């Protein structure tokens, strides 16, 4: 009837951070060494970390040394695993597992396991934006919609920096898809829509992306 | 149990002014009150604690007074760097309660928004998504309401808004509202409209287009 | 300079769980009450939780009591906030804040703050699947592709349960978008593709969605 | 310390007595444990300190060995015993596992029946193209599926899913789904999946031309 339950699993992008927790049922963790283990795709198990009683020792596998941190909370019976600078090979099912008391044995197996939580690290840490026109139709307004990019920021200029009066570039918004979106607009003389060409120059440094988009009447 | 109320919610002022913001507590809190400054995207900074004690490094133009249930922050000689949000906070042994915040902005005349609507581009539509954009340009003050109507049906849950900071030249704001639909949902309707209300407008302003322009 | 830094923010769906942590630089947390505060849309600050020294008491705002947990790790100087059964109104910037500690004062304000981490709770806790046909073109194969649903599971039957021989419904796969997808296939006599109609019945209980899809040869 | 399990996959029948071997690259005395794991479930400890049976574990499981050589023995395989088994060397500060041994139900070799499905016009119109390749009723489970688009090998844009052993005929089935945007889909003509399996004398290709 001894139970463990992990929480905090989800999708992360390469280089990101994620924190897992583990709660327990029908025992107190204080007398037990607590551990994190992962099953990778392919079926093999991999020991990740251990923390002894009273946190006298914290031990990590080499592949996570310096990136992961384990903590314990004996008063409310919780274990934590911080994962930073995550890599694709961190993708796995993560379980928390209890060992016997390290005050009573120098070598114990993992005798109770939680059901696991899935952690997926996507290989793409960056994604370039799609640029669409906001076409005009005394004073007219036009612009560029910069959609579906990661991470921040994106810089927008107009006519290679020659046009700056009346330009508004809005703060990015985070969409439910996990990607960012913004708009940049400019107001211009309505008579100039035939003579002047208007080009928005979008730069996304994290993905080394540069897009020039011509905004004309349709 | 302690509720904190700041007055006013928004304060318009000019450089050089002396301004006051008050914080009122629903019950006596002695002098366990602090004031914080916060600029957009940054962390709060403590200015004043125990109602009147100035934190070391904070300019002398900031001062605080009051007790019991009534407290006052005073800025004597407003500078540009001082335009920001200010928060009052009652702090106790285990918990803390804050005010709703007071945004201090640059004073200018009321300006109604200029409204524009943009249909989705054919490229994005072919890719399978339709973003319809509504722009409210150069308005003051910042509070405005934008609603979307599709074939005269009021929309909910499918739009997102973004607002700029005060323009460096004319001290106005601008706001964008983006309505996102699937290509099929987009193409099963004709009239797309954006409706705007602002204190500078006597009646709502609607801008619309018909799909297939 | 005394510094705090939050980690663990990101995107979660309503009802899900997310855990934040806070590390520090140039001071030890053990002598300080530590706090979590959030800035909501509209600009106001909102106290979330506090944990006293030696964890003698853990205090929570009413809106989060029973859903959030705060923990501290004084030996390596970390603070944690577990958030469960999350709601849209949990969307905010979350900061960890230190309460002062003086041998000269028993009650201090929040004198040091982290820069904050963004937490976004999307409104949709469930999403129904899209069902597409896998057209059959001695023994032929046909089926249904059940794509873009959340959460698990989806049930698939064929011809309201009358057809079960040779049916394989595959384990769901998690796509890079965060949504699940699966396929269900069946092999049938090739001569029956003209006479017999084949319908896949897809049931997604979490969103109360039911779809019947007819699978025919294409031309 | 490196742990090596033999074999990687063990095909057996109900009632058999089977052995799985675990070798340590250096002596680990008797600090060795065995675990059972079924798909989608948590591992269960069976045996620790090489030979001590955990309370509640059926007596048909036994373990032996020392130094660098260890053996798990199941005497009287039952259906419930078909699963993956892991050996693990455990110390105070570090631990390491073998690669795992999957125990499956033995049957004759069966080559897959291969089918390819182009995306439906509805999904294509919505902006995405899912191309599906099906491998039906094969044994053993090891198979290789590759995607070729205009004879160019694809990578990173497909996902696979595999069933458990069928209760009736003990075979497997596998699906591979290649996902592209509508724009990427429509700039190519020939879409093919190539399958390699022990039951096939040569790789089998199923293909179609986009739009026909």
Curated annotation (Swiss-Prot), chain A:
Disulfide bonds join 144-200. GO terms for biological process: adaptive immune response. GO terms for cellular component: extracellular region; immunoglobulin complex; plasma membrane. Keywords: Adaptive immunity, Cell membrane, Disulfide bond, Glycoprotein, Immunity, Immunoglobulin, Immunoglobulin domain, Membrane, Pyrrolidone carboxylic acid, Repeat, Secreted. Residues 129-216 form the Ig-like domain. Immunoglobulins are composed of two identical heavy chains and two identical light chains; disulfide-linked. Immunoglobulins, also known as antibodies, are membrane-bound or secreted glycoproteins produced by B lymphocytes. In the recognition phase of humoral immunity, the membrane-bound immunoglobulins serve as receptors which, upon binding of a specific antigen, trigger the clonal expansion and differentiation of B lymphocytes into immunoglobulins-secreting plasma cells. Secreted immunoglobulins mediate the effector phase of humoral immunity, which results in the elimination of bound antigens. This is Immunoglobulin gamma-1 heavy chain. It comes from Homo sapiens (Human).
UniProtKB/Swiss-Prot annotation, chain C:
Residues 129-216 form the Ig-like domain. It comes from the Eukaryota. It is found in: Secreted; Cell membrane. Disulfide bonds join 144-200. The lineage of its organism: Eukaryota, Metazoa, Chordata, Craniata, Vertebrata. Immunoglobulins, also known as antibodies, are membrane-bound or secreted glycoproteins produced by B lymphocytes. In the recognition phase of humoral immunity, the membrane-bound immunoglobulins serve as receptors which, upon binding of a specific antigen, trigger the clonal expansion and differentiation of B lymphocytes into immunoglobulins-secreting plasma cells. Secreted immunoglobulins mediate the effector phase of humoral immunity, which results in the elimination of bound antigens. This is Immunoglobulin gamma-1 heavy chain. Immunoglobulins are composed of two identical heavy chains and two identical light chains; disulfide-linked. The chain holds residues 120 to 221 of 449 of the full protein. It comes from Homo sapiens (Human).
Swiss-Prot record, chain D:
Disulfide bonds join 133-193. This is Immunoglobulin kappa light chain. The chain holds residues 109 to 213 of 214 of the full protein. Immunoglobulins, also known as antibodies, are membrane-bound or secreted glycoproteins produced by B lymphocytes. In the recognition phase of humoral immunity, the membrane-bound immunoglobulins serve as receptors which, upon binding of a specific antigen, trigger the clonal expansion and differentiation of B lymphocytes into immunoglobulins-secreting plasma cells. Secreted immunoglobulins mediate the effector phase of humoral immunity, which results in the elimination of bound antigens. It comes from Homo sapiens (Human). It is found in: Secreted; Cell membrane. Immunoglobulins are composed of two identical heavy chains and two identical light chains; disulfide-linked. Residues 108-212 are annotated as: Constant (C) domain. Residues 112-209 form the Ig-like domain.
């Amino acid at each position: 009837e001894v139970q463990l339950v992990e929480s905090g699993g989800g999708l992360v992008k390469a280089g990101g951070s994620l924190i897992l927790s583990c709660g327990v049922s029908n025992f107190r963790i204080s007398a037990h060494t607590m551990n994190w283990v992962r099953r990778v795709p392919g079926g093999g198990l991999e020991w990740v970390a251990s923390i002894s009683t009273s946190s006298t020792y914290r031990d990590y596998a080499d592949a996570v040394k310096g990136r992961f941190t384990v903590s314990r909370d004996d008063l409310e019976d919780f274990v934590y695993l911080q994962m930073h600078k995550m890599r694709v090979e961190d993708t796995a099912i993560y379980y928390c597992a209890r060992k016997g008391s390290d005050r009573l044995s120098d070598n114990d197996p993992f005798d109770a396991w939680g059901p696991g939580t899935v952690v997926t690290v996507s290989p793409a840490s960056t994604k370039g934006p799609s640029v669409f026109p906001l076409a005009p139709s005394g004073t007219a307004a036009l612009g560029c919609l910069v959609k579906d990019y990661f991470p921040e920021p994106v810089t927008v200029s107009w006519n290679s920096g020659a046009l700056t009066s009346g330009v508004h570039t809005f703060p990015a918004v985070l969409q439910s898809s996990g990607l960012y979106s913004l708009s940049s607009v400019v107001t211009v003389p309505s008579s100039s829509l035939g003579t002047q060409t208007y080009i928005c120059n979008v730069n996304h440094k994290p993905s080394n992306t540069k897009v020039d988009k011509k905004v004309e009447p349709k | 149990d302690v509720v904190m109320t700041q007055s006013p919610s928004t304060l318009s002022a000019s450089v050089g002014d002396t301004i006051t913001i008050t914080c009122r507590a629903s019950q006596s809190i002695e002098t366990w009150l602090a004031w914080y400054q916060q600029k957009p995207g940054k962390a709060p900074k403590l200015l004043i604690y125990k109602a009147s004690t100035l934190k070391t490094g904070v300019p002398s133009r900031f001062s605080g007074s009051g007790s019991g249930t009534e407290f006052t922050l005073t800025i004597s000689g407003l500078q540009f760097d001082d335009f920001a949000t200010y928060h009052c906070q009652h702090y106790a042994g285990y918990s803390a309660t804050f005010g709703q915040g007071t945004r201090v902005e640059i004073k200018r005349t009321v300006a109604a928004p200029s409204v524009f609507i943009f249909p989705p581009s054919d490229e994005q539509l072919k890719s399978g998504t339709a973003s319809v954009v509504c722009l409210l340009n150069n308005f003051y003050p910042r509070e405005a309401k934008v609603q979307w109507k599709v074939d005269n049906a009021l929309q909910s849950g499918n739009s997102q808004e973004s607002v700029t900071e005060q323009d460096s030249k004319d001290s106005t704001y601008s706001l964008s509202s983006t309505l996102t639909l699937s290509k099929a949902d987009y193409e099963k309707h004709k009239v797309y409209a954006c409706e705007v209300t602002h204190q500078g407008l006597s009646s709502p302003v609607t801008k619309s287009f018909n799909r297939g322009e």
